Write a protein that binds this ligand. Structure first.
Ligand SMILES: [Mg+2]
Ligand SMILES: [Mg+2]
Ligand SMILES: [Mg+2]
Ligand SMILES: [Mg+2]
Lengths: 37, 175, 136, 63
RNA sequence: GGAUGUGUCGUCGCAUAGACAGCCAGGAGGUUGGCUUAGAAGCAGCCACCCUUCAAAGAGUGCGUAAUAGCUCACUGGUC
RNA sequence: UCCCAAAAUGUAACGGAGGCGCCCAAAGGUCACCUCAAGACGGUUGGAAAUCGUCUGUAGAGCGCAAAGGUAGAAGGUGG
């Protein structure tokens, strides 16, 4: 879980999911779990 | 481009999608005011080498040719445009751009094809027959080959303006 | 990068853009939306990254040479006059000013070079296309 | 089929830059024996349909 | 700096002549391209991006191994 | 003397550059008279400049020194 203030796509499996006022990204690849919070 | 009112105060122009334009030739010099979108759709095609039908509010179709545009800074949307009512025989000198067709024999070898001058202004364009483009052979070029305006075919009835020995296109070396 | 022989010192002031077209010497370009100062080392960085991205070409045009000497604080104090004769040079940049232009590469191959350089500039910028034909 | 070309045209190696400096040039006669020995490895049509296949490879090899 | 947060104008292209996402199915023969390297065959970099069959399959996107494999996408058909 | 000085004048700082503490019996007075720098072409101790000549040339020179202003109808250069 890498906390980056700049979350952007890195492949073709990354899906941005807006949660409870937070930026998260789902992906089959567990190394692509970026999150601003 | 259906032209409507044409005052002098830009009060009812900035708010709405209108752009301030003018037109002249040698007689009348009445200022106009054309639509933003209409122009942004038409100038994209005919550019500066093609006239368009300009009907003023009332029934006045006056043929003209775009001369100088004064686009705005900080923005891509123009703010002023100058028009020239084409005469019939010898109007004004028109600027004709230079395109390129066919793959060169120097681009393959490793070098790159570089147009030194995009736009090229000529003399006496000739009404009703204005060159909207310009096709210049590029394949005959290799590495370090310079092609001037003495090498560009004339669109028949058109004479050059710039110096005969000016480099229009040149194939630069790699790196 | 740096000038070859000038006077020495200078002043400071920003007014609206003046002499920056849209399409000059090439197909694609990059413009400022914000008025600032461009250190020479910033330029160098840009130029260089652009080089990395474009193995062969050398069709990178940079017409924003730095002609502004800026002074600097020796150590401390304040007793004494004009300080820091040589620190760095700058290239005033006003919105509308064309800093960088390139040609030959595709569409995708310009967004990249530009996008990168852009992460080295102290102000936002944008990429444009051909459509303007003022003076030639 | 590159081996056969490196034998027929007598090519020691090839060319790193086929866009600048090439290797050599052969003839169609040396192509007929290629589409005659490697028949099962080609499902082309007839004559030309198998003559334009090999010519392809050669084109990017430096011939 | 970053993002399918929303409201409101616009630039490009795709239409039942049946998209797009999803699902089922197929996926090259030249070829193990040439070259450089102990080796790198879509996927380090130099180069190209040519041909055929076909309702059709770009010597090609990501992940991988010491190279191989495999798992897919571009594209085609069908069911709503 | 410039610049700062923000278009009358004026205006500060341990702000930014550079000079003077002289010189000329002529470099004064007056009266006459001459026209520069530079480049090109062509010439011998030259072969960069210069000496000569023919062109071009609002002066891109000169004015004892620093600078600005100003000067070709002279405040440039000589003679009685
Ligand atoms: Mg200010
Ligand atoms: Mg004053
Ligand atoms: Mg004042
Ligand atoms: Mg005071």
């Amino acid at each position: 879980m890498k906390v980056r203030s700049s979350v952007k796509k890195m492949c073709d499996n990354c899906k941005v999911v807006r949660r409870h006022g937070r930026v998260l990204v789902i992906c089959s690849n567990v190394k692509h779990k970026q999150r601003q919070g | 481009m259906e032209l409507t009112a044409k005052p002098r105060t830009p009060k009812q122009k900035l708010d709405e999608s209108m752009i301030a334009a003018v037109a002249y030739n040698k007689e009348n010099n009445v200022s106009f005011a054309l639509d933003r979108k209409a122009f942004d759709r038409a100038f994209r095609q005919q550019s500066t080498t093609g006239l368009f039908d300009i009907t003023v509010e009332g029934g006045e179709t006056f043929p003209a040719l775009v001369k100088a545009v004064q686009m705005d800074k900080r923005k891509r949307a123009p703010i002023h445009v100058d028009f020239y009512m084409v005469t019939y025989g010898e109007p004004v000198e028109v600027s004709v751009p230079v395109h390129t067709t066919g793959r060169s024999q120097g681009e393959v070898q490793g070098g790159l094809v570089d147009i030194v001058v995009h736009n090229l202004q000529i003399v006496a364009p000739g009404p009703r027959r204005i060159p909207q483009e310009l096709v210049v052979d590029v394949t005959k070029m290799n590495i370090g080959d310079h092609i001037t305006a003495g090498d560009i075919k004339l669109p028949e009835g058109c004479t050059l303006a710039a110096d005969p020995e000016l480099t229009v296109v040149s194939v630069l070396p790699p790196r | 990068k740096r000038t070859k022989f000038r006077k020495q010192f200078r002043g400071r002031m920003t007014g609206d853009a003046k002499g920056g077209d849209y399409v000059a010497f090439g197909d694609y370009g990059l413009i400022a939306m914000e008025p600032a100062w461009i250190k020479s080392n910033q330029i160098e960085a840009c130029r260089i990254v652009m080089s990395r991205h474009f193995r062969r070409g050398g069709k990178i045009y940079i017409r924003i040479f730095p002609d502004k000497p800026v002074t600097k604080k020796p150590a401390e104090t304040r007793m004494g006059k004009g300080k820091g004769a040589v620190e760095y040079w700058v290239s005033v940049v006003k919105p509308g000013r064309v800093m960088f232009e390139v040609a030959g590469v595709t569409e995708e191959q310009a967004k990249e070079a530009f996008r990168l350089a852009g992460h080295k500039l102290p102000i936002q910028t944008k990429m444009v296309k051909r459509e303007v034909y003022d003076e030639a | 089929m590159s081996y056969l070309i490196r034998k027929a045209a007598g090519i020691g190696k090839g060319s790193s830059t086929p866009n600048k400096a090439k290797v050599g040039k052969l003839n169609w006669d040396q192509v007929l024996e290629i589409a005659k020995t490697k028949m099962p490895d080609l499902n082309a049509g007839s004559v030309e349909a198998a003559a334009n296949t090999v010519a392809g490879t050669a084109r990017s090899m430096g011939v």
